[PDB]
Amino acid sequence: RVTLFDGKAHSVDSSDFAFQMAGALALRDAAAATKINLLEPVDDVTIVVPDDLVGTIMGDLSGRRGRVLGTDKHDADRTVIKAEIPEVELVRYAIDLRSMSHGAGQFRRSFARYEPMP
Amino acid sequence: SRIGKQPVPVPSGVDVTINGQNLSVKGPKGTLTLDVAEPISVSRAEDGAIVVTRPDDERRSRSLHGLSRTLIANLVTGVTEGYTQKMEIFGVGYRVQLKGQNLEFALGYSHPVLIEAPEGITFAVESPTKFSVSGIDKQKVGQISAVIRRLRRPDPYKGKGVRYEGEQIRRKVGKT
């Protein structure tokens, strides 16, 4: 929210473009007068992996700052893992997972929301 | 010390000869010879045993006491019964088979590896993955068993190689 409470102008040297620039510079100064919050997106990831590798993937997500939401039994031998991971950590998630899984690693992602950087 | 004052029983079929410091033991599995250190005195307990005695209580004699006693005990139990230690081999394509006295191993090398049988010891393979080493002398059996064990470097990941009977090796995981 921007609240213009005062200002100055010239009888001859006042123009709409000049006031546009003045408002932009005032906003820039206000931004430099405080801190700026950076918001990064997070994508929910649902992964199907065998139950024998649950701990390894959970710890890998632990090193990936992932927030575990729940471990759902996909079937008698695989568990669906629901978790939201920042998109930065998912750039090379697939290759490492196929590693963490003898390729067995299958997952889907979808944008969830934006959150500030920790 | 505590081991030292325990006399060593002699089985019936065992012949024991003492010549000064020297000792010789003859039994069903063969003959063996030993020598004890000067401060330690060896005697034939007439009730059918061996007695080792240290005149002093100083460090060197007290250390040599139990050493000599255990050496004599191993000496007699080698000829009365013997020594036999068992080995297994783990992994795919890892095999053993005997060529007469010699022992032949396929350990994933480009070439097969061979081990001679030194004097006074024999190899007996039971299955292509399980074999045994037998001899009358404990020290030589242990030496050759260690040499066999060192054939392939430790493998914490897949556990391939030659292992002792009940050995529990440490293992880690290569995740990638």
Automatic annotation (TrEMBL), chain A:
Origin superkingdom: Bacteria
Name by which UniProt lists this protein: Elongation factor G-like protein
Protein species of origin: Mycolicibacterium smegmatis (strain ATCC 700084 / mc(2)155)
Lineage: Bacteria, Bacillati, Actinomycetota, Actinomycetes, Mycobacteriales
